[PDB]
Amino acid sequence: VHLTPAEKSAVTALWGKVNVDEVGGEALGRLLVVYPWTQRFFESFGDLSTPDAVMGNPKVKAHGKKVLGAFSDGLAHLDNLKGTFATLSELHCDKLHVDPENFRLLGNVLVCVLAHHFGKEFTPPVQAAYQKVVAGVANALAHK
Amino acid sequence: VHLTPAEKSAVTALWGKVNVDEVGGEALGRLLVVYPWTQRFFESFGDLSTPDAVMGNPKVKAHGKKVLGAFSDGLAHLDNLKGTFATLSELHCDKLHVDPENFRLLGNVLVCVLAHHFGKEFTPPVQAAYQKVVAGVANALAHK
Amino acid sequence: VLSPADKTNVKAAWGKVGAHAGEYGAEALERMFLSFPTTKTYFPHFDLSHGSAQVKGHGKKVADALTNAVAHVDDMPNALSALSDLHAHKLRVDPVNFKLLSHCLLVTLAAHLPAEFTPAVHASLDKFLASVSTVLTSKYR
Amino acid sequence: VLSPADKTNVKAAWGKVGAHAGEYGAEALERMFLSFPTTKTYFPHFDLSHGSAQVKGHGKKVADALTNAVAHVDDMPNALSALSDLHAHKLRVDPVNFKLLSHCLLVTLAAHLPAEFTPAVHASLDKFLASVSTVLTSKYR
Numbered sequence: 227v228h229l230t231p232a233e234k235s236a237v238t239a240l241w242g243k244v245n246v247d248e249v250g251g252e253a254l255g256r257l258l259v260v261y262p263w264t265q266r267f268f269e270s271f272g273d274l275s276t277p278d279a280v281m282g283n284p285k286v287k288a289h290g291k292k293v294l295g296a297f298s299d300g301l302a303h304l305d306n307l308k309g310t311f312a313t314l315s316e317l318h319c320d321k322l323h324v325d326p327e328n329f330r331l332l333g334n335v336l337v338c339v340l341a342h343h344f345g346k347e348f349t350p351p352v353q354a355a356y357q358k359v360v361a362g363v364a365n366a367l368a369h370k
Numbered sequence: 371v372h373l374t375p376a377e378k379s380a381v382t383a384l385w386g387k388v389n390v391d392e393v394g395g396e397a398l399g400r401l402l403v404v405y406p407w408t409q410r411f412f413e414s415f416g417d418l419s420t421p422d423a424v425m426g427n428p429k430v431k432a433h434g435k436k437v438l439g440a441f442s443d444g445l446a447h448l449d450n451l452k453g454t455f456a457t458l459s460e461l462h463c464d465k466l467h468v469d470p471e472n473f474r475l476l477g478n479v480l481v482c483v484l485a486h487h488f489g490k491e492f493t494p495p496v497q498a499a500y501q502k503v504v505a506g507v508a509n510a511l512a513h514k
Numbered sequence: 515v516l517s518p519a520d521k522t523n524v525k526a527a528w529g530k531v532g533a534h535a536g537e538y539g540a541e542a543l544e545r546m547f548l549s550f551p552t553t554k555t556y557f558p559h560f561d562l563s564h565g566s567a568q569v570k571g572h573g574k575k576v577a578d579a580l581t582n583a584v585a586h587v588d589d590m591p592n593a594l595s596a597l598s599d600l601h602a603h604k605l606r607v608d609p610v611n612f613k614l615l616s617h618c619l620l621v622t623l624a625a626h627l628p629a630e631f632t633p634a635v636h637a638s639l640d641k642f643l644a645s646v647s648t649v650l651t652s653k654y655r
Numbered sequence: 656v657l658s659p660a661d662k663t664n665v666k667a668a669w670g671k672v673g674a675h676a677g678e679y680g681a682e683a684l685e686r687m688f689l690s691f692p693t694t695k696t697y698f699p700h701f702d703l704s705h706g707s708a709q710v711k712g713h714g715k716k717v718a719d720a721l722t723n724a725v726a727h728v729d730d731m732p733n734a735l736s737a738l739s740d741l742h743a744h745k746l747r748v749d750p751v752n753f754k755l756l757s758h759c760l761l762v763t764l765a766a767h768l769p770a771e772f773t774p775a776v777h778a779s780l781d782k783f784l785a786s787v788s789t790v791l792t793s794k795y796r
């Protein structure tokens with residue numbers, strides 16, 4: 227929601243280094259592995275029976291890139307997160323009935339993946355800014 | 371949020387039968403017994419070391435009547451729960467820092483208490499209507 | 515983690531249920547489906563109409579499964595392994611739904627056993643159902 | 656409920672932590688206090704400045720208790736009974752704060768031990784920390 231200008235710069239600087247072909251799919255894959263009931267919403271994706279099956283699943287990697295693209299849109303619309311995700315909120319809440327705690331889980335898994343990729347560069351202040359971002363995205367997706 | 375008129379009548383008819391000097395104190399006391407960490411927010415209330423201590427505590431009973439009054443206010447303003455509880459949301463979220471999951475717990479404890487007092491009169495349709503009420507109050511109280 | 519007093523409370527309160535076990539299990543299920551309609555998506559193969567014999571039969575299965583959980587309260591993972599297979603491995607039930615059914619069971623018990631539903635018994639039952647819920651939602655084999 | 660594979664994953668991952676346990680515990684605390692400032696209300700007697708010796712000392716205590724939980728992973732209620740008394744009976748910590756510290760610990764391990772933070776180990780560690788959190792927030796005496 228409200229990031230200080232220095233917080234906004236730090237978040238934007240790190241995001242520009244994100245590998246858009248792996249981080250998204252790894253976050254989704256880890257969600258399906260660490261919180262296995264989430265697999266129920268992805269019955270059309272095929273083999274999710276082992277962690278390697280999940281992380282290697284082409285539909286997981288493909289869909290993970292789409293999720294990561296939505297986070298990028300939220301990052302450029304921190305003032306109006308409710309409007310950017312209003313469509314996506316209707317999809318997840320009225321069509322899919324995803325319990326919103328799962329939104330919080332995915333945001334925290336993404337934060338783990340960012341820590342995994344950047345190591346010591348993912349400092350506690352940078353994490354603190356990202357927790358505000360993912361909380362705001364999760365709140366927007368549950369708005370409806 | 372959206373209660374049908376038949377739900378509004380059922381909710382209102384039962385609420386008018388509530389013992390306003392006991393039900394609130396029983397809801398707050400059960401929250402403190404069933405979810406004992408909530409006692410940390412009420413350190414000035416005295417003895418909370420046993421269930422009988424909690425249920426018999428006069429400050430629990432006194433504060434419980436005020437909580438019940440706030441639910442009564444929400445019942446007569448189901449259209450604008452956010453405005454009715456806007457001031458209470460500021461208190462609980464900015465001054466008290468109560469995690470909003472505890473709002474959901476208290477609403478569900480109240481539902482258990484209504485079931486306790488009304489028995490077979492607390493039918494599944496009547497419960498379904500009250501779950502909409504307490505959900506809306508919990509959401510309004512967490513609005514920020 | 516249940517205390518010894520918790521286990522005593524659950525065994526005494528659930529003991530009073532008796533032959534009404536199925537009736538209460540079916541009513542808790544009815545309460546869940548009406549109060550939280552998304553939970554109905556796990557039973558599309560069920561007739562969920564009011565008074566359905568199929569919900570009545572299921573409610574007895576759930577109630578009897580809880581009785582089995584009381585009986586094996588100190589080593590629930592082994593006793594409920596088949597139900598963990600079903601709920602965690604097969605049906606992949608979101609844990610939030612266990613909080614919903616657990617709440618509806620407490621509501622049913624409060625409505626039918628008001629003298630026994632003391633605050634202490636309520637606390638112990640809530641913990642017991644939370645413990646059953648963790649076993650049924652955990653993949654441990 | 657932890658699987659055999661979970662327990663193996665946790666013991667192997669915690670084995671690589673080694674002499675850095677206290678450092679990781681102090682870093683997880685610092686991350687929690689910064690990301691989730693409400694958690695600081697449990698430590699009003701602490702100097703919470705960056706690099707605080709009090710936070711470093713406490714981080715070592717937290718890490719060593721986790722080490723003890725790893726050693727006694729099948730007997731955590733007995734092994735952690737003193738810590739349950741502290742956190743559940745005395746401090747009355749809201750369970751949400753355990754999810755926050757657990758998340759911050761996972762972030763710290765991912766940042767420092769990337770080769771070890773596989774998806775499977777991530778899952779096992781999350782379950783292990785949830786089980787520790789249940790023991791410390793439960794009153795079972």
Ligand code: HEM
Nearest residue numbers: 264267268292293296297314324328329330332333364367
């Ligand atoms: C919290 C952050 C989340 C974001 C930003 C997000 C974003 C998205 C996006 C962009 C899509 C694609 C919609 C389209 O086709 O235009 C999508 C679809 C979908 N999402 Fe999410 N999502 C989130 C959380 C979740 C969670 C937690 C779940 C379930 C556990 C979930 C389940 C799904 C499913 C099942 C689809 C449809 C997939 C398909 O059939 O192709 N989402 N989401």
Ligand code: HEM
Nearest residue numbers: 408411412436437440441458468472473474476477508511
């Ligand atoms: C969810 C429904 C809730 C309602 C309708 C509600 C309502 C109220 C009301 C009307 C007051 C009195 C404020 C005044 O003096 O004007 C109050 C105060 C307070 N509430 Fe709540 N509340 C709710 C939930 C909670 C929860 C879940 C907690 C903590 C676990 C909590 C903790 C407190 C505390 C500590 C006070 C101040 C008590 C005092 O000053 O002695 N409330 N609340």
Ligand code: HEM
Nearest residue numbers: 553556557575576579580597600605607611612615646650
């Ligand atoms: C107190 C918690 C629960 C207990 C003790 C329990 C117990 C049971 C039992 C005994 C069965 C029958 C197993 C068999 O026939 O082999 C069953 C099946 C089933 N349960 Fe649960 N259950 C619980 C919670 C839930 C929840 C929360 C859901 C979803 C919202 C759910 C969904 C199902 C479904 C879909 C089936 C299969 C029904 C069928 O095909 O006959 N259960 N459960």
Ligand code: HEM
Nearest residue numbers: 694697698716717720721738741746748752753756787788
């Ligand atoms: C993985 C979970 C946790 C573990 C293993 C853990 C472990 C410990 C240990 C070993 C102590 C020291 C006991 C002693 O010195 O005798 C302690 C104290 C304490 N813990 Fe925790 N803790 C955990 C989570 C939390 C959380 C989430 C909070 C609050 C946000 C918290 C708040 C405290 C406080 C306030 C103290 C007392 C500090 C003092 O007075 O020195 N703990 N904990």
